[PDB]
Amino acid sequence: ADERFQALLTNVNAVRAIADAVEGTLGPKGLDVMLVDKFGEVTITNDGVTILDQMDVQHPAARMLIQVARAQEEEVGDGTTTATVLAGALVSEGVNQVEQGVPVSRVIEGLRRGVERALELLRKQALPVEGLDDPRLRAVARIAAREREDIADLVVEAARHIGEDKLQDPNFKLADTVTAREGAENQVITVLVGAATEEVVGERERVAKDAASAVQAAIRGGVVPGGGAAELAVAREVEKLAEEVKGMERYGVEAVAEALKKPLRQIVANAGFNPLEKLGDLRAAHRTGNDSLGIDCDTGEVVDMWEAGVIDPAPVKLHALKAAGEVAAAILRINTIIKMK
């Protein structure tokens, strides 16, 4: 019986190891991560899409996490680091509840129901954007471009050059029509991103594609209050569902609720504030009936995110949580490890 639980725990530690390596890269004030070879070559990156690919992943439980997260990347080209951290949080709290005594089969179904409710509520909470000149697009472009307005303005300028219905085509990807070249200026003819040297072209191109995907998702499915405020907003309702759920299955709904607190908790933690005290006051002001109250990452105060400008696309946040649930259930189900031929 302990062997069945032990086989689950080592799977969790593999997922947690990957989830812990990218959690420092969350938010506008994320911390970069050092990557090292045996030869000694090193790259410094604050983006998750690259750290997950360039990182060693030898435990076979982590390979599924990377594959599912980059499938989410293949869909919309953003939100891999949120999905990985949410999957890690869900699996961590699930194994914690299993340690308490809850059977794993109960936790799996509780997680399934809680994640389904969370997707429902996040879909219902996202409101559609009113035209393209509405500067919520300019807001969600800036956050995706590492707070560099030079790329952010040109992505929205290209978006206005394309149009609305021409961007509503499912077969058309705006990321593939951007290109970065060295020694050029910022013009759109094909989106030409200027770069100084030849070595800096890669990261400028990558952030150009990230802003491209963000602005695409903004038209495709609306916007959500970023910074994890929407995650807390759905976490409270998932807790209410947990109180609604019968039997031992509820302890998985609590696992969904606590895992939805991890993105905002780490947004605060990486910003350099105490996560617990700055979550307490954030829950303090949420009694007014509005569920769009976040925390600014510079002064640490409770401020509504619509005026702060911290906005996130809706499809990316929906699909990150969907993938996190799908790749937490699959890793919780595994109970034995056997060898082959």
Contact 94, 231 (CB under 8 A): no
Burial of 236 (0-12, 13-18, 19+ CB in 10 A): middle
Q: Which of 2, 74, 100, 288 binds its own copies (CB under 8 A)?
A: 100
Cα gap 341→336, rounded to integer Å: 17
**30-69 binders of its own copies (CB under 8 A):** 31-38, 40-44, 46, 51, 54-56, 58, 60-61, 63-64
Closest CA to 182 of 206, 205, 209, 159: 205
The reply on whether position 171 binds its own copies by CB under 8 A is: no
- Of 186 and 274, which CB lies nearer to its own copies in the complex structure? 274
The reply on whether position 250 binds its own copies by CB under 8 A is: yes
Q: How many CA atoms lie within 13 A of 179 on its CB side?
A: 9
Closest CA to 77 of 136, 155, 133: 155
Residues ≥6 apart with Cβ < 8 Å to 129: 136, 137, 218, 219, 222, 223
The reply on whether position 189 binds its own copies by CB under 8 A is: no
**3-22 binders of its own copies (CB under 8 A):** 4, 7, 11, 21
Q: Which of 173, 300, 306, 309 binds its own copies (CB under 8 A)?
A: 300
Query: Which of 76-84, 95-103, 147-155, 177-185 is the region at the interface with its own copies (rule: CB under 8 A)?
Result: 95-103
Report the nearest approach of its own copies to the CB of residue 208 (Å).
Answer: 22
Q: Which of 163, 200, 284, 290 binds its own copies (CB under 8 A)?
A: 284
The reply on whether position 2 binds its own copies by CB under 8 A is: no
Q: How many CA atoms lie within 13 A of 154 on its CB side?
A: 21
- Of 135 and 280, which CB lies nearer to its own copies in the complex structure? 280
The reply on whether position 186 binds its own copies by CB under 8 A is: no
Number of residues that bind its own copies (CB under 8 A): 71
The reply on whether position 74 binds its own copies by CB under 8 A is: no
Burial of 99 (0-12, 13-18, 19+ CB in 10 A): exposed
The reply on whether position 200 binds its own copies by CB under 8 A is: no
Q: Which of 13, 96, 105, 292 binds its own copies (CB under 8 A)?
A: 105
Report the nearest approach of its own copies to the CB of residue 33 (Å).
Answer: 5
Cα gap 171→173, rounded to integer Å: 7
Long-range contacts of 168-173 (CB under 8 A, 24+ apart): 168/219, 168/220, 173/77, 173/216
